[PDB]
Structure 1
Amino acid sequence: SGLVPRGSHMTPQVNQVNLSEIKQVLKQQLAEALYTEESEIAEDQKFVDLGLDSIVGVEWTTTINQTYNLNLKATKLYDYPTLLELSGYIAQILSSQGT
């Protein structure tokens, strides 16, 4: 996955949903949830360290499901406090629902 957003130019309607493609989106979705910008969020930093709580984790877990058409809960935030692992799991769910 040589998909690295740098802000040089926009990305088109990419059909696929690679691991990194989900990872970058997750950062963006969670940035707004933490009242910040994804530009300052790390991929291996814990959402909780930034301020992800029990409330935000439950609402955010839903937006994720709606984005990739899955079923997940608050326990996900607790199992994968970083985008790296979070995305790792999601990528397998959508890859199984279509095979």
Structure 2
Amino acid sequence: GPGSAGRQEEIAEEVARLLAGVLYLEPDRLDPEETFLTLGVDSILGVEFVAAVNAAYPVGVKATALYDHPTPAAFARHIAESLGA
């Protein structure tokens, strides 16, 4: 069958690609294990990343999830479980 590590891992990559797009960066040089604050997410860029995830998927996620999950690799697990992955 498929070589995939898990269903949620595809969404963890895609959330890191969305974050690199908001931060005007390459996903090849973004660290997905690093915090949003250390990656340089300002207040407006946090709201724009949350809005980009709400546009990408019908998950309806609120900006309070940035405090519950401090990295994109943690945050994407909620975006995956709300899609049933």
Q: Same fold (TM over 0.5)?
A: yes
Alignment TM-score, normalising by the size of structure 1: 0.73
Partners of 1:30 and 1:43 lie apart in 2 by: 9
Gaps of 5+ in 1: 5-17
Say whether 1:86 aligns with 2:79.
Answer: no
Return the structure number with greater helix share.
Answer: 1
Indicate conservation of the 8 Å contact 2:16/2:73, yes or no. Answer: no
Note if contact 2:16-2:30 (Cα within 8 Å) is conserved in structure 1.
yes
Paired letter, 2:32: E
Amino acid at match of 2:22: A
Residue 44 (structure 2) aligns with: 55
Q: What's the RMSD between the two structures over aligned residues?
A: 2.2
Aligned length: 84
Mark the runs of 5 or more structure 2 residues left unpaired by the alignment: none
User: Which structure exhibits the higher relative contact order, with contacts defined as CA atoms closer than 8 Å and separated by 6 or more residues?
Assistant: 2
TM-score scaled by length of structure 2 = 0.84
The structure with the larger Rg is 1
Paired-residue identity, %:
36
Runs of 4+ in 1 over 2 A off after TM superposition: 1-4
